């Protein structure tokens, strides 16, 4: 069973807003809502691959972000240690830069179902903010 390492962002605006994309159909989680991310490479922290993937996935800079939280996550035929990193500053303006749906979601419309399984504490957590 493989073992990754996984950072994502929760791209938080003033308007109690997430920026939210889509999962591909033939992706691990397929259809499910997502914070972008993705894995932590060799030779790069977790501080680092959050910035990187987001620069990928949706074309901002992350700055002055904080450890939302850590967990660890065990589905059917791979283990996951999720970092959720809290971005509520960044530069440039969040799109899918990957070919992907993405769009701002409200932080209480969130509904956990819509997000892998693992997400289902940290949507609880954001919400109590
Ligand atoms: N990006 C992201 N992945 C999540 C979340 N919740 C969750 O369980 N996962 C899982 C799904 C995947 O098994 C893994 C994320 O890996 P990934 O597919 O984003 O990795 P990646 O973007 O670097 O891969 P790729 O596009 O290069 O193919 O973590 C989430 O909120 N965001
Ligand atoms: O681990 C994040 C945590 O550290 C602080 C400083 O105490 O922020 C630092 O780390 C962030 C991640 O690299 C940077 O974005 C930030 O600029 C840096 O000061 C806390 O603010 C944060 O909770
Ligand atoms: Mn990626
Ligand atoms: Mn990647
Ligand atoms: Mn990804």
């Not at 499910?32 to 996935?57: C, D, H, S, W, Y």
């Not at 509904?111 to 892998?116: E, M």
């Amino acid at each position: 069973m493989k073992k990754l390492q996984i950072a994502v962002g929760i791209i938080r605006n003033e308007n109690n807003e997430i920026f939210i994309t889509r999962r591909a159909a033939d992706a691990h989680m397929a259809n499910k809502l997502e914070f972008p991310g993705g894995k932590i490479e060799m030779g790069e922290t977790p501080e680092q691959a959050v910035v990187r993937e987001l620069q990928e996935e949706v074309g901002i800079t992350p700055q002055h972000f904080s450890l939302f939280e850590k967990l660890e996550y065990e589905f059917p035929d791979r283990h996951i240690t999720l970092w959720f990193w809290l971005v509520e500053r960044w530069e440039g303006e969040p799109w899918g830069k990957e070919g992907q749906p993405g769009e701002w979601m409200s932080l209480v419309g969130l509904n956990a179902d819509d997000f892998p399984p693992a997400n289902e504490p940290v949507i609880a957590k954001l919400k109590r903010l």
